Amino acid sequence: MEEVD
Amino acid sequence: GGSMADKEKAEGNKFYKARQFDEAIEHYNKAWELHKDITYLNNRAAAEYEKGEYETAISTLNDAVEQGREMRADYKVISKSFARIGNAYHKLGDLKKTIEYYQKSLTEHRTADILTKLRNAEKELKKAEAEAYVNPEKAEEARLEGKEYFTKSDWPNAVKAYTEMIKRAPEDARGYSNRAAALAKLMSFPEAIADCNKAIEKDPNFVRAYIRKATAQIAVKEYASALETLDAARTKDAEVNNGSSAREIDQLYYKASQ
């Protein structure tokens, strides 16, 4: 999954 | 809110991690509402992306960079925006813009990934454009142009013509054998050998290509090889051609022994 910050 | 909006974000991240994307999205919006910081928008774009709404993601991100610029946001985070646009475009199968947005991300902040993703997307584009270049009728047009230059002893142009044919029809063994013929005339023999080899992997039954290989090998005094190539040539000639080019093989066999 895409990185969340 | 400082710690206030950071909770909304953190709550988003909790939902995002459990693949509850609309729930994540709503908390990311709350975070933005409480405290203008583009991180929260990048995160909503992640949720939008994971939903498979690639257009929404690009939209969210294009806005994020515009607002981040107005806010003078850290160069790293806007580099992530551009990077995620790149990912989204790649999911859309738009190779031009994925490359364009990777460039844009690297311009903002060069990272290891994105540099690797750029090279992979460029690789993928080369392969695609090559597969689009393939054309039956343009290949036949090139085969005819080559024979015309070959009949007029115009080897340099024949080479070019036959290269177009190789590009228009990469599976047609005639293109390689033909370029190999012109290369030999120009006395570029190692290249003639190499084109003959690819012709033989494209068509194991293509006799003329074995004969060129051997002829060029003889020309560069590679005698041991020339005889092997000639054996192979004679075996495939019996099978495929009823041995109808045996007298030609023999002359070369005699020269390769002398």
Side-chain angles (χ1 to χ4, degrees):
Chain A
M1 278 195 298
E2 289 291 294
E3 192 87 15
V4 283
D5 280 0
Chain B
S3 66
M4 192 172 183
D6 212 62
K7 190 78 182 198
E8 292 308 301
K9 184 200 83 174
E11 206 58 37
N13 298 351
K14 204 187 173 187
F15 273 104
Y16 180 84
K17 210 262 193 72
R19 287 196 147 79
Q20 289 184 248
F21 300 120
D22 296 308
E23 299 90 328
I25 288 176
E26 75 176 296
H27 287 293
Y28 294 145
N29 283 333
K30 192 49 203 292
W32 176 249
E33 183 206 298
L34 294 155
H35 165 56
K36 309 260 96 75
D37 175 320
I38 65 158
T39 308
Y40 310 138
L41 307 171
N42 281 354
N43 281 1
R44 192 185 85 196
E48 285 151 8
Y49 175 100
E50 292 306 341
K51 273 182 70 182
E53 305 292 337
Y54 305 120
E55 190 44 78
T56 315
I58 296 158
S59 206
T60 311
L61 290 158
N62 274 321
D63 173 273
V65 5
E66 201 145 312
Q67 298 216 222
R69 256 147 205 189
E70 211 276 344
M71 286 175 63
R72 314 197 183 287
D74 167 43
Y75 59 97
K76 300 189 168 77
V77 6
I78 132 145
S79 184
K80 288 158 170 186
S81 300
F82 285 140
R84 191 158 285 147
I85 301 171
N87 290 7
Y89 271 118
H90 193 209
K91 286 327 273 268
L92 282 171
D94 184 336
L95 262 33
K96 241 104 154 167
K97 290 209 202 294
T98 158
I99 283 158
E100 180 199 323
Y101 280 88
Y102 289 153
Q103 313 257 53
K104 293 253 264 298
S105 171
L106 293 170
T107 287
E108 200 76 22
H109 179 221
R110 46 181 67 180
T111 64
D113 344 299
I114 317 304
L115 189 60
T116 315
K117 297 220 220 309
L118 174 61
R119 290 168 78 263
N120 293 357
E122 264 162 22
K123 196 199 169 190
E124 203 182 315
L125 178 66
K126 250 146 159 285
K127 182 186 147 69
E129 282 164 346
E131 283 165 359
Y133 202 72
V134 178
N135 188 279
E137 270 154 348
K138 292 199 181 297
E140 178 59 24
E141 216 69 297
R143 193 188 67 85
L144 292 175
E145 271 196 37
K147 187 174 150 68
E148 214 56 62
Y149 292 134
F150 204 91
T151 312
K152 260 279 176 284
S153 294
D154 193 337
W155 320 127
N157 277 331
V159 176
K160 283 190 186 178
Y162 286 137
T163 310
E164 168 74 346
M165 189 192 163
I166 283 154
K167 257 133 185 52
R168 295 299 181 168
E171 312 308 326
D172 189 344
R174 293 171 302 172
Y176 300 94
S177 162
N178 286 345
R179 197 170 59 187
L183 286 165
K185 281 298 181 175
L186 294 158
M187 301 188 299
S188 276
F189 299 121
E191 291 72 41
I193 309 302
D195 279 355
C196 288
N197 285 147
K198 199 71 75 184
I200 289 156
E201 73 139 275
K202 291 300 167 198
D203 180 8
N205 290 346
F206 190 42
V207 176
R208 178 50 60 191
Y210 285 88
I211 292 164
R212 290 201 209 284
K213 190 188 163 179
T215 301
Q217 276 167 328
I218 285 161
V220 295
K221 296 156 77 190
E222 288 271 344
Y223 295 128
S225 321
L227 288 159
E228 292 178 63
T229 308
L230 283 164
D231 286 319
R234 198 185 274 109
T235 297
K236 288 283 170 171
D237 202 49
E239 175 190 353
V240 173
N241 269 206
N242 194 48
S244 59
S245 57
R247 271 138 53 167
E248 201 192 322
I249 275 96
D250 285 2
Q251 300 285 77
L252 302 168
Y253 179 92
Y254 300 153
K255 282 203 161 193
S257 301
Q258 228 80 304

Short mmCIF file of all heavy atoms in Angstrom, two decimals, chain B residues 168-231:
data_model
loop_
_atom_site.label_atom_id
_atom_site.label_comp_id
_atom_site.label_asym_id
_atom_site.label_seq_id
_atom_site.Cartn_x
_atom_site.Cartn_y
_atom_site.Cartn_z
N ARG B 168 10.54 -3.13 -37.94
CA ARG B 168 9.15 -3.29 -38.33
C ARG B 168 8.66 -4.74 -38.21
O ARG B 168 7.46 -4.99 -38.06
CB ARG B 168 8.90 -2.76 -39.75
CG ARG B 168 9.10 -1.26 -39.91
CD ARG B 168 8.16 -0.44 -39.04
NE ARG B 168 8.36 1.00 -39.22
CZ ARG B 168 7.54 1.94 -38.77
NH1 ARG B 168 6.44 1.63 -38.11
NH2 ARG B 168 7.83 3.22 -38.99
N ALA B 169 9.59 -5.68 -38.27
CA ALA B 169 9.24 -7.09 -38.17
C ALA B 169 10.38 -7.83 -37.49
O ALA B 169 11.19 -8.47 -38.16
CB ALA B 169 8.95 -7.67 -39.55
N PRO B 170 10.44 -7.76 -36.15
CA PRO B 170 11.57 -8.34 -35.41
C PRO B 170 11.65 -9.86 -35.50
O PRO B 170 12.71 -10.43 -35.23
CB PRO B 170 11.33 -7.89 -33.97
CG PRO B 170 10.26 -6.86 -34.03
CD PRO B 170 9.43 -7.21 -35.23
N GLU B 171 10.56 -10.51 -35.88
CA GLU B 171 10.52 -11.98 -35.95
C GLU B 171 10.84 -12.55 -37.34
O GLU B 171 10.97 -13.77 -37.49
CB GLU B 171 9.18 -12.52 -35.44
CG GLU B 171 8.71 -11.94 -34.11
CD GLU B 171 9.75 -12.00 -33.00
OE1 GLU B 171 10.54 -12.97 -32.94
OE2 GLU B 171 9.77 -11.07 -32.16
N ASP B 172 10.99 -11.68 -38.34
CA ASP B 172 11.30 -12.08 -39.72
C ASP B 172 12.81 -12.24 -39.90
O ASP B 172 13.55 -11.25 -39.85
CB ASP B 172 10.75 -11.04 -40.69
CG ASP B 172 10.83 -11.47 -42.16
OD1 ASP B 172 11.56 -12.42 -42.51
OD2 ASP B 172 10.14 -10.82 -42.97
N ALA B 173 13.27 -13.47 -40.11
CA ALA B 173 14.70 -13.76 -40.15
C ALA B 173 15.41 -13.10 -41.32
O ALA B 173 16.62 -12.83 -41.25
CB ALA B 173 14.93 -15.26 -40.16
N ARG B 174 14.65 -12.81 -42.38
CA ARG B 174 15.19 -12.18 -43.59
C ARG B 174 15.84 -10.82 -43.34
O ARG B 174 16.79 -10.46 -44.04
CB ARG B 174 14.11 -12.04 -44.66
CG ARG B 174 13.61 -13.37 -45.22
CD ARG B 174 12.39 -13.19 -46.11
NE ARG B 174 11.29 -12.55 -45.39
CZ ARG B 174 10.16 -12.13 -45.95
NH1 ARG B 174 9.96 -12.27 -47.25
NH2 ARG B 174 9.23 -11.55 -45.21
N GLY B 175 15.33 -10.07 -42.37
CA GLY B 175 15.87 -8.75 -42.05
C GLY B 175 17.31 -8.81 -41.56
O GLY B 175 18.15 -8.01 -41.98
N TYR B 176 17.58 -9.78 -40.69
CA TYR B 176 18.91 -9.98 -40.12
C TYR B 176 19.89 -10.53 -41.15
O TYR B 176 21.03 -10.05 -41.25
CB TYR B 176 18.82 -10.91 -38.91
CG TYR B 176 17.93 -10.39 -37.81
CD1 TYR B 176 16.59 -10.76 -37.75
CD2 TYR B 176 18.43 -9.51 -36.83
CE1 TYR B 176 15.76 -10.28 -36.74
CE2 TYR B 176 17.61 -9.03 -35.82
CZ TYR B 176 16.28 -9.42 -35.78
OH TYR B 176 15.45 -8.95 -34.79
N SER B 177 19.46 -11.54 -41.90
CA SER B 177 20.27 -12.14 -42.94
C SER B 177 20.62 -11.09 -44.00
O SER B 177 21.76 -11.03 -44.48
CB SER B 177 19.53 -13.30 -43.58
OG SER B 177 20.09 -13.64 -44.83
N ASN B 178 19.64 -10.27 -44.35
CA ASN B 178 19.81 -9.19 -45.32
C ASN B 178 20.77 -8.11 -44.83
O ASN B 178 21.68 -7.72 -45.57
CB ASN B 178 18.46 -8.59 -45.68
CG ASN B 178 17.65 -9.49 -46.58
OD1 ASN B 178 18.18 -10.42 -47.17
ND2 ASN B 178 16.35 -9.20 -46.69
N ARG B 179 20.58 -7.63 -43.60
CA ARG B 179 21.55 -6.68 -43.03
C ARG B 179 22.93 -7.33 -42.99
O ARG B 179 23.92 -6.68 -43.29
CB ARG B 179 21.12 -6.17 -41.64
CG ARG B 179 21.88 -4.92 -41.21
CD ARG B 179 21.31 -4.25 -39.96
NE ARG B 179 21.31 -5.14 -38.81
CZ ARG B 179 20.75 -4.85 -37.63
NH1 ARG B 179 20.15 -3.68 -37.43
NH2 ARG B 179 20.79 -5.74 -36.65
N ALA B 180 22.98 -8.62 -42.66
CA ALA B 180 24.24 -9.37 -42.64
C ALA B 180 24.93 -9.39 -44.01
O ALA B 180 26.16 -9.29 -44.08
CB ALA B 180 24.01 -10.79 -42.15
N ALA B 181 24.15 -9.51 -45.07
CA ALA B 181 24.68 -9.46 -46.44
C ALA B 181 25.33 -8.10 -46.74
O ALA B 181 26.46 -8.06 -47.23
CB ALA B 181 23.60 -9.76 -47.46
N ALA B 182 24.63 -7.01 -46.43
CA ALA B 182 25.14 -5.65 -46.66
C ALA B 182 26.37 -5.32 -45.80
O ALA B 182 27.33 -4.72 -46.29
CB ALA B 182 24.04 -4.62 -46.43
N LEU B 183 26.34 -5.74 -44.54
CA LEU B 183 27.46 -5.56 -43.62
C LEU B 183 28.73 -6.23 -44.12
O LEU B 183 29.84 -5.70 -43.96
CB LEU B 183 27.12 -6.09 -42.23
CG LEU B 183 26.15 -5.26 -41.39
CD1 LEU B 183 25.63 -6.10 -40.24
CD2 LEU B 183 26.80 -3.97 -40.90
N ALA B 184 28.57 -7.41 -44.72
CA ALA B 184 29.69 -8.17 -45.24
C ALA B 184 30.32 -7.45 -46.43
O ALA B 184 31.56 -7.40 -46.56
CB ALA B 184 29.23 -9.56 -45.64
N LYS B 185 29.47 -6.90 -47.29
CA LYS B 185 29.93 -6.11 -48.44
C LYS B 185 30.80 -4.93 -47.97
O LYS B 185 31.85 -4.67 -48.57
CB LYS B 185 28.75 -5.63 -49.29
CG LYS B 185 28.17 -6.69 -50.22
CD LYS B 185 29.22 -7.16 -51.22
CE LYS B 185 28.68 -8.21 -52.19
NZ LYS B 185 29.69 -8.56 -53.22
N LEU B 186 30.36 -4.27 -46.90
CA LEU B 186 31.14 -3.21 -46.25
C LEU B 186 32.28 -3.73 -45.38
O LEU B 186 32.98 -2.95 -44.74
CB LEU B 186 30.22 -2.33 -45.40
CG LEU B 186 29.18 -1.51 -46.15
CD1 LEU B 186 28.04 -1.14 -45.22
CD2 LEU B 186 29.81 -0.27 -46.78
N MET B 187 32.45 -5.05 -45.37
CA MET B 187 33.56 -5.72 -44.67
C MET B 187 33.51 -5.57 -43.14
O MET B 187 34.55 -5.68 -42.47
CB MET B 187 34.93 -5.30 -45.24
CG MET B 187 35.11 -5.62 -46.72
SD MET B 187 36.78 -5.35 -47.37
CE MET B 187 37.01 -3.59 -47.11
N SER B 188 32.32 -5.31 -42.61
CA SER B 188 32.09 -5.35 -41.16
C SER B 188 31.65 -6.76 -40.79
O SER B 188 30.46 -7.02 -40.59
CB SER B 188 31.02 -4.34 -40.74
OG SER B 188 31.59 -3.06 -40.55
N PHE B 189 32.61 -7.67 -40.71
CA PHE B 189 32.31 -9.09 -40.60
C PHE B 189 31.75 -9.56 -39.23
O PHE B 189 30.75 -10.29 -39.22
CB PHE B 189 33.48 -9.96 -41.09
CG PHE B 189 33.84 -9.74 -42.54
CD1 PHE B 189 35.12 -9.31 -42.89
CD2 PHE B 189 32.91 -9.96 -43.55
CE1 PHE B 189 35.47 -9.11 -44.22
CE2 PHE B 189 33.25 -9.76 -44.89
CZ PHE B 189 34.53 -9.34 -45.23
N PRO B 190 32.37 -9.15 -38.09
CA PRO B 190 31.84 -9.60 -36.79
C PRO B 190 30.36 -9.25 -36.62
O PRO B 190 29.60 -10.03 -36.04
CB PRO B 190 32.69 -8.83 -35.77
CG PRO B 190 33.96 -8.52 -36.49
CD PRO B 190 33.56 -8.29 -37.92
N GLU B 191 29.97 -8.09 -37.15
CA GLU B 191 28.58 -7.66 -37.18
C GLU B 191 27.74 -8.56 -38.11
O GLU B 191 26.62 -8.91 -37.77
CB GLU B 191 28.47 -6.19 -37.63
CG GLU B 191 29.00 -5.16 -36.63
CD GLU B 191 30.52 -5.14 -36.51
OE1 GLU B 191 31.21 -5.23 -37.55
OE2 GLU B 191 31.02 -5.03 -35.36
N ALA B 192 28.30 -8.94 -39.26
CA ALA B 192 27.62 -9.85 -40.18
C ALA B 192 27.33 -11.20 -39.52
O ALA B 192 26.23 -11.74 -39.66
CB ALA B 192 28.43 -10.03 -41.46
N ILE B 193 28.32 -11.72 -38.78
CA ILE B 193 28.16 -12.95 -38.00
C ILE B 193 26.99 -12.83 -37.02
O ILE B 193 26.14 -13.73 -36.95
CB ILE B 193 29.42 -13.27 -37.17
CG1 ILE B 193 30.69 -13.24 -38.04
CG2 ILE B 193 29.26 -14.59 -36.42
CD1 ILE B 193 30.69 -14.19 -39.21
N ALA B 194 26.97 -11.73 -36.27
CA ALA B 194 25.97 -11.51 -35.23
C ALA B 194 24.54 -11.45 -35.77
O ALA B 194 23.62 -12.03 -35.20
CB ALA B 194 26.30 -10.26 -34.43
N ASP B 195 24.36 -10.74 -36.88
CA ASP B 195 23.06 -10.69 -37.54
C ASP B 195 22.63 -12.07 -38.08
O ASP B 195 21.46 -12.44 -37.96
CB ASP B 195 23.05 -9.63 -38.65
CG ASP B 195 22.82 -8.22 -38.12
OD1 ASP B 195 22.56 -8.05 -36.90
OD2 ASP B 195 22.89 -7.28 -38.93
N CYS B 196 23.57 -12.82 -38.65
CA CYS B 196 23.31 -14.20 -39.07
C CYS B 196 22.89 -15.09 -37.91
O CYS B 196 22.00 -15.93 -38.06
CB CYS B 196 24.54 -14.80 -39.76
SG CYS B 196 24.85 -14.13 -41.40
N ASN B 197 23.52 -14.91 -36.75
CA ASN B 197 23.16 -15.68 -35.57
C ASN B 197 21.73 -15.43 -35.10
O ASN B 197 21.01 -16.38 -34.75
CB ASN B 197 24.15 -15.43 -34.43
CG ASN B 197 25.46 -16.14 -34.63
OD1 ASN B 197 26.51 -15.66 -34.23
ND2 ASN B 197 25.42 -17.30 -35.27
N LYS B 198 21.31 -14.16 -35.10
CA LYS B 198 19.96 -13.81 -34.71
C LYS B 198 18.95 -14.30 -35.77
O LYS B 198 17.83 -14.68 -35.43
CB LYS B 198 19.83 -12.30 -34.44
CG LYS B 198 18.61 -11.87 -33.61
CD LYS B 198 18.68 -12.27 -32.14
CE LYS B 198 19.65 -11.40 -31.34
NZ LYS B 198 19.82 -11.83 -29.92
N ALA B 199 19.37 -14.32 -37.04
CA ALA B 199 18.53 -14.87 -38.11
C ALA B 199 18.28 -16.35 -37.89
O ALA B 199 17.17 -16.85 -38.14
CB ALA B 199 19.16 -14.63 -39.48
N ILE B 200 19.30 -17.05 -37.40
CA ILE B 200 19.22 -18.48 -37.15
C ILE B 200 18.39 -18.81 -35.90
O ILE B 200 17.72 -19.85 -35.85
CB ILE B 200 20.62 -19.14 -37.14
CG1 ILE B 200 21.19 -19.15 -38.57
CG2 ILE B 200 20.58 -20.55 -36.56
CD1 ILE B 200 22.70 -19.22 -38.65
N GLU B 201 18.41 -17.94 -34.89
CA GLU B 201 17.50 -18.15 -33.77
C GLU B 201 16.05 -17.81 -34.14
O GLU B 201 15.12 -18.39 -33.58
CB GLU B 201 17.97 -17.48 -32.46
CG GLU B 201 17.84 -15.96 -32.39
CD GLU B 201 17.36 -15.48 -31.03
OE1 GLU B 201 16.12 -15.47 -30.80
OE2 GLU B 201 18.20 -15.11 -30.18
N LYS B 202 15.86 -16.91 -35.10
CA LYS B 202 14.52 -16.58 -35.57
C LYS B 202 13.94 -17.65 -36.49
O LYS B 202 12.73 -17.85 -36.53
CB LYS B 202 14.48 -15.21 -36.28
CG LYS B 202 14.70 -14.01 -35.37
CD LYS B 202 13.64 -13.90 -34.28
CE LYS B 202 14.05 -12.89 -33.22
NZ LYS B 202 13.26 -13.06 -31.97
N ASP B 203 14.83 -18.33 -37.22
CA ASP B 203 14.43 -19.38 -38.16
C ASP B 203 15.56 -20.41 -38.30
O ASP B 203 16.46 -20.24 -39.12
CB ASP B 203 14.08 -18.75 -39.52
CG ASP B 203 13.66 -19.78 -40.57
OD1 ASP B 203 13.48 -20.98 -40.24
OD2 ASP B 203 13.50 -19.37 -41.74
N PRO B 204 15.51 -21.49 -37.49
CA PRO B 204 16.57 -22.51 -37.50
C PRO B 204 16.74 -23.18 -38.86
O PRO B 204 17.79 -23.77 -39.13
CB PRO B 204 16.10 -23.53 -36.46
CG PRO B 204 15.18 -22.77 -35.57
CD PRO B 204 14.48 -21.79 -36.47
N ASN B 205 15.73 -23.07 -39.72
CA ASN B 205 15.71 -23.73 -41.02
C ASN B 205 16.13 -22.82 -42.18
O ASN B 205 15.89 -23.16 -43.35
CB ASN B 205 14.33 -24.31 -41.29
CG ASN B 205 14.01 -25.51 -40.41
OD1 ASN B 205 14.90 -26.08 -39.77
ND2 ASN B 205 12.75 -25.91 -40.38
N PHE B 206 16.75 -21.69 -41.88
CA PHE B 206 17.07 -20.70 -42.89
C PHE B 206 18.50 -20.87 -43.36
O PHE B 206 19.43 -20.39 -42.72
CB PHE B 206 16.81 -19.29 -42.33
CG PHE B 206 16.87 -18.19 -43.36
CD1 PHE B 206 16.30 -18.35 -44.61
CD2 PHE B 206 17.47 -16.98 -43.04
CE1 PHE B 206 16.35 -17.32 -45.55
CE2 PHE B 206 17.52 -15.95 -43.97
CZ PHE B 206 16.96 -16.12 -45.23
N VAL B 207 18.67 -21.55 -44.49
CA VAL B 207 19.99 -22.02 -44.94
C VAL B 207 20.93 -20.88 -45.33
O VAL B 207 22.09 -20.85 -44.90
CB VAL B 207 19.87 -23.06 -46.09
CG1 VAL B 207 21.24 -23.47 -46.60
CG2 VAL B 207 19.11 -24.29 -45.62
N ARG B 208 20.43 -19.95 -46.14
CA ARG B 208 21.21 -18.81 -46.63
C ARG B 208 21.96 -18.11 -45.50
O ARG B 208 23.08 -17.63 -45.69
CB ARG B 208 20.29 -17.85 -47.40
CG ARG B 208 20.91 -16.57 -47.95
CD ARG B 208 22.20 -16.81 -48.74
NE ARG B 208 22.00 -17.68 -49.90
CZ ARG B 208 22.99 -18.21 -50.61
NH1 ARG B 208 24.25 -17.97 -50.30
NH2 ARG B 208 22.71 -18.99 -51.65
N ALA B 209 21.35 -18.07 -44.31
CA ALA B 209 21.95 -17.41 -43.15
C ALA B 209 23.16 -18.16 -42.60
O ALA B 209 24.10 -17.54 -42.11
CB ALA B 209 20.91 -17.21 -42.06
N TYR B 210 23.14 -19.48 -42.69
CA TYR B 210 24.29 -20.30 -42.29
C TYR B 210 25.45 -20.09 -43.25
O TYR B 210 26.62 -20.10 -42.85
CB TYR B 210 23.93 -21.78 -42.29
CG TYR B 210 23.06 -22.25 -41.14
CD1 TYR B 210 21.68 -22.19 -41.22
CD2 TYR B 210 23.64 -22.80 -40.00
CE1 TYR B 210 20.88 -22.64 -40.18
CE2 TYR B 210 22.85 -23.26 -38.95
CZ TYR B 210 21.47 -23.18 -39.06
OH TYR B 210 20.69 -23.64 -38.03
N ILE B 211 25.11 -19.90 -44.53
CA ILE B 211 26.11 -19.74 -45.58
C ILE B 211 26.82 -18.39 -45.47
O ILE B 211 28.04 -18.32 -45.62
CB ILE B 211 25.50 -19.99 -46.98
CG1 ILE B 211 25.12 -21.47 -47.13
CG2 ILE B 211 26.46 -19.59 -48.08
CD1 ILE B 211 24.19 -21.76 -48.28
N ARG B 212 26.06 -17.33 -45.19
CA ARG B 212 26.64 -16.02 -44.91
C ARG B 212 27.55 -16.06 -43.69
O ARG B 212 28.66 -15.54 -43.73
CB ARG B 212 25.57 -14.97 -44.70
CG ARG B 212 24.81 -14.60 -45.95
CD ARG B 212 24.14 -13.25 -45.80
NE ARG B 212 22.94 -13.20 -46.61
CZ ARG B 212 22.93 -13.06 -47.94
NH1 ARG B 212 24.06 -12.93 -48.60
NH2 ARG B 212 21.77 -13.05 -48.59
N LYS B 213 27.08 -16.67 -42.60
CA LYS B 213 27.87 -16.76 -41.37
C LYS B 213 29.25 -17.34 -41.67
O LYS B 213 30.28 -16.74 -41.34
CB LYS B 213 27.15 -17.58 -40.30
CG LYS B 213 27.80 -17.51 -38.93
CD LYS B 213 27.17 -18.48 -37.93
CE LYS B 213 28.10 -18.69 -36.74
NZ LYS B 213 27.55 -19.60 -35.71
N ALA B 214 29.25 -18.50 -42.33
CA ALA B 214 30.46 -19.21 -42.70
C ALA B 214 31.36 -18.37 -43.61
O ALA B 214 32.58 -18.35 -43.42
CB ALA B 214 30.11 -20.52 -43.37
N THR B 215 30.76 -17.70 -44.59
CA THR B 215 31.50 -16.88 -45.56
C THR B 215 32.24 -15.75 -44.86
O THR B 215 33.40 -15.46 -45.16
CB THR B 215 30.56 -16.31 -46.65
OG1 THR B 215 29.91 -17.39 -47.34
CG2 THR B 215 31.32 -15.45 -47.66
N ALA B 216 31.56 -15.12 -43.90
CA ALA B 216 32.12 -14.02 -43.14
C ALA B 216 33.17 -14.52 -42.16
O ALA B 216 34.17 -13.84 -41.93
CB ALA B 216 31.02 -13.27 -42.40
N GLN B 217 32.94 -15.71 -41.61
CA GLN B 217 33.91 -16.35 -40.72
C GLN B 217 35.21 -16.68 -41.45
O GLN B 217 36.30 -16.43 -40.93
CB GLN B 217 33.32 -17.59 -40.07
CG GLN B 217 32.49 -17.28 -38.84
CD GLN B 217 31.65 -18.44 -38.38
OE1 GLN B 217 31.19 -19.25 -39.18
NE2 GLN B 217 31.43 -18.52 -37.08
N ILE B 218 35.08 -17.22 -42.66
CA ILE B 218 36.23 -17.46 -43.54
C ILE B 218 36.97 -16.14 -43.81
O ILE B 218 38.20 -16.10 -43.77
CB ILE B 218 35.80 -18.13 -44.87
CG1 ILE B 218 35.49 -19.61 -44.65
CG2 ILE B 218 36.87 -17.96 -45.94
CD1 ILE B 218 34.65 -20.24 -45.76
N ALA B 219 36.21 -15.08 -44.08
CA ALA B 219 36.77 -13.77 -44.39
C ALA B 219 37.59 -13.20 -43.24
O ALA B 219 38.55 -12.47 -43.48
CB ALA B 219 35.68 -12.80 -44.81
N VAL B 220 37.22 -13.53 -42.01
CA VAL B 220 38.03 -13.16 -40.84
C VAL B 220 38.86 -14.33 -40.31
O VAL B 220 39.19 -14.39 -39.12
CB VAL B 220 37.19 -12.52 -39.70
CG1 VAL B 220 36.59 -11.20 -40.16
CG2 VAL B 220 36.12 -13.49 -39.19
N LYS B 221 39.18 -15.25 -41.22
CA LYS B 221 40.09 -16.38 -40.96
C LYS B 221 39.72 -17.23 -39.73
O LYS B 221 40.59 -17.83 -39.10
CB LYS B 221 41.55 -15.90 -40.90
CG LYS B 221 42.08 -15.31 -42.21
CD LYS B 221 43.23 -14.35 -41.98
CE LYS B 221 44.54 -15.07 -41.69
NZ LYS B 221 45.61 -14.14 -41.23
N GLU B 222 38.43 -17.28 -39.41
CA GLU B 222 37.90 -18.17 -38.38
C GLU B 222 37.55 -19.52 -39.01
O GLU B 222 36.39 -19.76 -39.35
CB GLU B 222 36.67 -17.54 -37.72
CG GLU B 222 36.96 -16.35 -36.82
CD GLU B 222 37.24 -16.75 -35.38
OE1 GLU B 222 36.92 -17.90 -35.00
OE2 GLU B 222 37.78 -15.91 -34.63
N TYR B 223 38.55 -20.38 -39.15
CA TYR B 223 38.41 -21.62 -39.94
C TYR B 223 37.71 -22.76 -39.21
O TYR B 223 36.85 -23.43 -39.80
CB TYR B 223 39.77 -22.07 -40.48
CG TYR B 223 40.37 -21.10 -41.48
CD1 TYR B 223 41.67 -20.62 -41.33
CD2 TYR B 223 39.63 -20.68 -42.59
CE1 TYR B 223 42.21 -19.73 -42.25
CE2 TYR B 223 40.16 -19.79 -43.51
CZ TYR B 223 41.45 -19.32 -43.34
OH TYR B 223 41.98 -18.44 -44.27
N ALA B 224 38.09 -22.99 -37.95
CA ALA B 224 37.47 -24.03 -37.12
C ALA B 224 35.96 -23.84 -37.08
O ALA B 224 35.21 -24.78 -37.35
CB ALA B 224 38.05 -24.00 -35.71
N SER B 225 35.53 -22.61 -36.78
CA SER B 225 34.12 -22.25 -36.72
C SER B 225 33.44 -22.42 -38.08
O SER B 225 32.38 -23.04 -38.17
CB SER B 225 33.95 -20.81 -36.24
OG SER B 225 34.86 -20.51 -35.21
N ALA B 226 34.08 -21.87 -39.12
CA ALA B 226 33.55 -21.93 -40.49
C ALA B 226 33.14 -23.34 -40.89
O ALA B 226 32.10 -23.53 -41.52
CB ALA B 226 34.56 -21.36 -41.47
N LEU B 227 33.94 -24.33 -40.51
CA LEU B 227 33.65 -25.73 -40.84
C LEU B 227 32.44 -26.27 -40.06
O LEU B 227 31.63 -27.00 -40.62
CB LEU B 227 34.88 -26.61 -40.65
CG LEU B 227 35.97 -26.41 -41.70
CD1 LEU B 227 37.32 -26.91 -41.19
CD2 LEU B 227 35.60 -27.08 -43.02
N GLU B 228 32.34 -25.90 -38.78
CA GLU B 228 31.18 -26.27 -37.96
C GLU B 228 29.89 -25.69 -38.54
O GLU B 228 28.92 -26.41 -38.79
CB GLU B 228 31.37 -25.82 -36.51
CG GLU B 228 32.47 -26.56 -35.77
CD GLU B 228 32.67 -26.06 -34.35
OE1 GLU B 228 31.73 -26.17 -33.53
OE2 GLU B 228 33.77 -25.55 -34.05
N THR B 229 29.91 -24.38 -38.79
CA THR B 229 28.80 -23.67 -39.43
C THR B 229 28.41 -24.32 -40.76
O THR B 229 27.24 -24.35 -41.13
CB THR B 229 29.16 -22.19 -39.68
OG1 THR B 229 29.62 -21.60 -38.46
CG2 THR B 229 27.95 -21.41 -40.17
N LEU B 230 29.40 -24.86 -41.47
CA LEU B 230 29.13 -25.48 -42.76
C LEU B 230 28.51 -26.87 -42.60
O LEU B 230 27.68 -27.26 -43.43
CB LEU B 230 30.38 -25.48 -43.65
CG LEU B 230 30.68 -24.11 -44.28
CD1 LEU B 230 32.10 -24.03 -44.82
CD2 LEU B 230 29.68 -23.75 -45.37
N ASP B 231 28.89 -27.58 -41.54
CA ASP B 231 28.26 -28.86 -41.20
C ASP B 231 26.79 -28.62 -40.91
O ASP B 231 25.92 -29.16 -41.60
CB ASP B 231 28.94 -29.51 -39.99
CG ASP B 231 30.29 -30.10 -40.33
OD1 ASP B 231 30.43 -30.72 -41.41
OD2 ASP B 231 31.23 -29.96 -39.51
#
